[PDB]
């Protein structure tokens, strides 16, 4: 149907607004800490502490999949990225604390894609 594209425009737009987003919280990591996923061959004990976690390519995999319906599905995912991090490490950390400039950084970045969102529709 006409109706099914129009949908289908609009969640690419959306993966398209995403997709900046996502460009933008990650260079919030310089240090690359949350590029990757946490290798269990070396933490093999992970998965008894986090139980959903996540990191940035992961995200960027269901981002091109156009996996993300809104932006609360992809906020979700970037506060467990802030989230997994600020439990597994203790605060005195480099590890928890690049987690807290993250999420310090990435709230600005939110906030203004939050208003993209609801203003484009």
């Known amino acids: ?13 959306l993966t398209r ?12 990591d310089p240090a690359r800490i949350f590029a990757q996923p946490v290798s269990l061959k070396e933490v093999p004990d992970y998965l008894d502490h986090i139980k959903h976690p996540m990191d940035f390519a992961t995200m960027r995999k269901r ?11 992809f906020e979700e995912d ?10 597994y490490n203790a605060r005195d950390t480099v590890f928890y604390r690049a987690a807290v400039r ?3 950084q990435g709230g600005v970045v939110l906030r203004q894609a939050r208003r993209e ?5």
């Open 117 to 121: 969102v609801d203003s484009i529709g």
């Open 78 to 87: 970037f506060d467990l990225i802030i989230d997994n991090c600020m439990k």
């Open 63 to 73: 981002l091109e999949a156009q996996g993300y319906k809104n932006l609360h599905e």
């Open 1 to 13: 149907s006409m109706e099914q594209v129009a949908m289908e425009l609009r969640l690419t737009e």
């Open 17 to 28: 607004l995403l997709r900046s987003v996502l460009d933008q919280l990650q260079d919030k």
């Open 102 to 104: 993250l999420r310090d």
